[PDB]
Design a protein around this ligand. Structure first.
Ligand SMILES: *[C@@H]1O[C@@H](C)[C@@H](O)[C@@H](O)[C@@H]1O
Ligand SMILES: *[C@@H]1O[C@@H](C)[C@@H](O)[C@@H](O)[C@@H]1O
Length: 114
């Protein structure tokens, strides 16, 4: 017998909770099922349409550490500092801040003086 399409399914929810997603619905060649000697169902069994929502949060990335500062002293124990920025990338769309220190300090030229 000739194939026959069911009614469509409901649309799924949007595939994604932010950014550009998709919604799907499906139909079966069962109304009736092409039993034998018969023409199939005409068209595709699935529609995918697009769904679009607000931009996905962009979490903070650490950019690269500054070259160390020059040591506070040429001998007998000093400090040097370096720094970094949360802008690789910058937190966007309620994305999370970077985790860890903006700064580092370390000893340098601990070698006893003449
Ligand atoms: C679903 O909810 C949205 C708001 C964001 O938190 C997404 O990362 C998540 O997939
Ligand atoms: C840097 O070099 C060391 C060895 C000493 O000469 C210091 O007094 C100087 O500033």
């Amino acid at each position: 017998q000739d194939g026959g399409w069911s009614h469509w399914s409901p649309w799924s929810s949007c595939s994604v909770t932010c950014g550009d997603g998709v919604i799907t619905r499906i139909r079966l060649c069962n109304s009736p099922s092409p039993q034998m000697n018969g023409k199939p169902c005409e068209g595709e069994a699935r529609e995918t349409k697009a769904c679009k929502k607000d931009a996905c949060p962009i979490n903070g990335g650490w950019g690269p550490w500054s070259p160390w500062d020059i040591c506070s002293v040429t001998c007998g124990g000093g400090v040097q500092k370096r720094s970094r920025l949360c802008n690789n990338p910058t937190p966007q769309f309620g994305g999370k801040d970077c985790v860890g220190d903006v700064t580092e300090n370390q000893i340098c030229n601990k070698q006893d003086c003449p």
